[PDB]
Symmetry: D2
Subunit: 332 residues, 4 copies
């Protein structure tokens, strides 16, 4: 399938890296009004977090050429003015953070594209998570969402645990790395005041919808989960801390067995498992959605427990975008 990209940021660029890594998806066009053709070369070649690109990159005849495949470049602010059709782009990835409703994202179809994928949650487009509800996707749907990074970590874990023991109620905290909507020194952040204070200096509390959204993707758990977040001064990689009460009694060692079996069968590639003494930098550029840390958790008794799971928020999420589009294309 042939693909386009709107917004060449952290997610936009890493999705592009992943597609050339696989060879199931082919990238044929890119739009970003604030990055010119020569500046694109530089930003794709060099990366502070994940390292130099292994391959070749240059500019020839007004196009971007990676490993020898030529790509068409555009520079528009309004999405209705982009000529996707002429270039041959059948699916579009929307990753600017500015167009997350159905009305707004709809503008792409006007330029001659078939379907659109939003790289964030949505107030009204239907949400999917690979491993959990992806089989509910249908070819009547022209606009869809891949949810948030945090929701892709929490959802696979809660499904296994709910199926085998049963969840009565629960509360979540995430300790999360820094992103591009934060600030270097104290400053203006609009309506959300704590989010504008110095990012290199502070621990910062913040809101999250990620836990209530599990209830859309798993109906049975609707109304039984919620949570919050802290932002801390590391540049990539994050962690989930889930505290919950169970229906059926369960020793800690029984919980471990069930999680390892799922990682070796149906959820291979998505949910991992480990007993080593790891820390955050050990998961930099890891491709899983969720990895269970067996040593770091604890139980008060047979009905009340605390569980711990790690995730690369940039590079894990990027690879789930590509997987989603492949599934979709097999149902055309």
């Amino acid at each position: 399938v042939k693909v386009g990209v709107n917004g060449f940021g952290r997610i936009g660029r890493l999705v592009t890296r992943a597609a050339f890594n696989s060879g199931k998806v082919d990238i044929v066009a890119i739009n970003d009004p604030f990055i010119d053709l020569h500046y694109m070369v530089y930003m794709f070649q060099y990366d502070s977090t994940h390292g130099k690109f292994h391959g070749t990159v240059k500019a020839e005849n007004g196009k971007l050429v990676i490993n020898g495949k030529a790509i068409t470049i555009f520079q528009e602010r309004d999405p209705a003015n982009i000529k996707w059709g002429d270039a041959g782009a059948t699916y579009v990835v929307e990753s600017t953070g500015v167009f997350t409703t159905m009305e707004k994202a709809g503008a792409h179809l006007k330029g001659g594209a078939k379907r659109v994928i939003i790289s964030a949650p949505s107030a009204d487009a239907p949400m999917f998570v690979m491993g959990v509800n992806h089989e509910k996707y249908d070819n009547s749907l022209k606009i869809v969402s891949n949810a948030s990074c945090t929701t892709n970590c929490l959802a696979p874990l809660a499904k296994v645990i709910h199926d085998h023991f049963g969840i009565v109620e629960g509360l979540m905290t995430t300790v999360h790395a820094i992103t591009a909507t934060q600030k270097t020194v104290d400053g203006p952040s609009g309506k959300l005041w704590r989010d504008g204070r110095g990012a290199a200096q502070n621990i910062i509390p913040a809101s999250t919808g990620a836990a209530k959204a599990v209830g859309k993707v798993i109906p049975e758990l609707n109304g039984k989960l919620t949570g919050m977040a802290f932002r801390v001064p590391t540049p990539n990689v994050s962690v989930v801390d889930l505290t919950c009460r169970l229906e059926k009694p369960a020793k800690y060692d029984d919980i471990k067995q069930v999680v390892k079996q799922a990682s070796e069968g149906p959820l291979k590639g998505i949910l991992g498992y480990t007993e080593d003494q790891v820390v955050s930098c050990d998961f930099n550029s890891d491709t899983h959605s969720s990895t269970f840390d067996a040593g770091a958790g604890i139980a008060l008794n047979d009905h009340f427990v605390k569980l711990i799971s790690w995730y690369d928020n940039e590079f894990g999420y990027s690879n789930r975008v590509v997987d989603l589009m492949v599934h979709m294309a097999s149902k055309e």
Copy 2:
């Protein structure tokens, strides 16, 4: 009342700063084999976290003089070889991290001191927390402990909540700043392998006894609490995240009213209260033990809730050491 210090580190120096500010406690001797007389002047004058000392500091006749008070300096590795009595030291503060049992800390009395206070938890000496059980102290006790920084934050908050609504069960996480037992780059750390990885780079999980210890200080809650910790890259100030279940039903607003009343009456100076949009740097050099953040917490139901409280782990703890010794002395 006149006092001695064994260990001139982060706690040892800041206790000394607090006592000169207050003026009920008087410091008359100091022991540290690794810091000579001229080096002591430099370390007390300048501080990276809390700033310059306002006052005068100099060296005269082989003694350390601050605002005109002369202090006797010693350099011994073995605590039994030290002559406290001769210098006139009636209480000793033990803050080296190496002598935390009753056998080991007992050596100070062989040198002619009356009573000893350990600045950390203990396997066998009795523990106290101002505001919670300090009225159970009595004259027969020669060796005592002031517990940990985390236990001084959690204990006051749980006593209010247990008294008014009742705690059935609960689980705790603390997000904590870096300390002097960590390492600048990957290296050896003994039995705890995760503790030696790079402190400037990582989020690091670790164990903590601070929640079980609440059960010794408040007998009724023995066996109903436990928890863990993460270490993150800030130089000072930490936070508690308590998830718990209640006996009597309670709306969020009712919980707020009960906490504000306690802060304004019998726990004034120990427990604070706030509704402003705060972050970690806002509590640097604050003197409270625990401050409730009303905006950051959340409730699932009338029986299931998440509560949030801040603490300066260096400077809050230092001031509680001083308060304890005053109580003690006024009962001799």
Copy 3:
């Protein structure tokens, strides 16, 4: 004397802090289209780098009131649409970073202000540096500039050394803390590509005009100095490293004596001197423009030498703005 502020950022707010502390300058109006009235209270009360404000701050009748003085608030993007005169603002401080030429800054006079001071270098307005050329100011000048933070550190030091021994030639490097034009993660930065890479992760080279500009402020040194900069991951405080060649021979001790004498006489308050073992945090909220570090420098010969000087780039500069306006007003 009564004054206005256009741009309530890091400099705009700290100038305001300095004036209330001193008491010769009085603030009566403030303009910032992106910070509303209630948001202003919060940003002035709490500060990550310098700490809480000691005083009272509140909102009453649509005006901002600090220790009982009411201030008029405006919200305009175009500086010509602003009514300075009506509020009683005789001088205006221009600290947005967007209006640094004479055409552009001229718009403030159309609103009824007398004189304007630009808080940055300028292509065409005349530049002044207290201690060096401030006595050349005169009444005919309606628009002026206070130069950059780096130029206020270098200029006083070079004038002493040129007067006593003579400078043939020289080259400068500054190691500088992070500012608000940098980025949290890899991203777009216009014409300067290196400036947009992750600020928490990297050492970053950049250009600076600060050394050539010394040649406008001291005509005799025109064409004999230039330099560059590196940006590093601290939140405040910077350092100068000057390498130079001399006309008259000079031992290191002779250089020290000449610098101490100037600090104790005609440059008191501007140029400091020290022989203690200092580091960067020791100068946080210091009010000098330049402090000579005697231990850190070194000489190859009696004609070839390396000199080292520290500066608080936020709070030192803020106090020089206030001093300039006093001089000006006492000559009306």
Copy 4:
């Protein structure tokens, strides 16, 4: 040639990585009293800066097995008690930082080893630098030194420039990343006071012998160079800033040509060259000793210039150790 390692730290472990990468050197024994057999596996597998080892690692029959080669493990404090001979170790790498003179390092020959290489400067063993004086090595010599990380960056650059234009005099500064002799919070550091202040918080000045040592390795430049250092809060990668005066006149573009030619001929693999807009993270795990940055430097005139060169202090240096031992072995 068969090789042993004393001190399994940052350098000790990365040298071991490099030798299995090449296949010119074979590692057969390791000594470290503070890291037991099972702890060695963990520290070699996982790395915060350079990433997971690509290969296999396990423990079998009391030995360490990497990619299937078995290695003998020892646990001694005194180097005279190690049985190098029995294990078959013909050369020994000394990387503890405690044994840097000829007397002290001599103890290894008593255990039955042939020659020793010190991974640091030395008060009396003879020093070498690949690319510059390695051809002066002789088979009469039993104990030798590979100099410091900084000296391996400066020396190759100064040789090219001195040969083509001539150096009359010069002064150096290095901006340098953090290491394991620093501290997480303010504390005791012995005789060097600034070196014990908080490493995550400050810019710290320090001494260096690296520039005078160039005069041993290049006799003609003895007495014409010296310098100093700043330490800053990044975990790896450093930079050199050399300011110097020339004999023969030279335009900037002439200096560039000469440096590029040397990088493509005799000094290929040791000295690099670049015109792109790079920053520090772009050189993480780079194998060169010195890379010239052409955009970042500047000239005041035809006789007076400032030059800039980057270096991975951990991973560049490690690969030069291995190269030295190969050369040596060809002269047996």
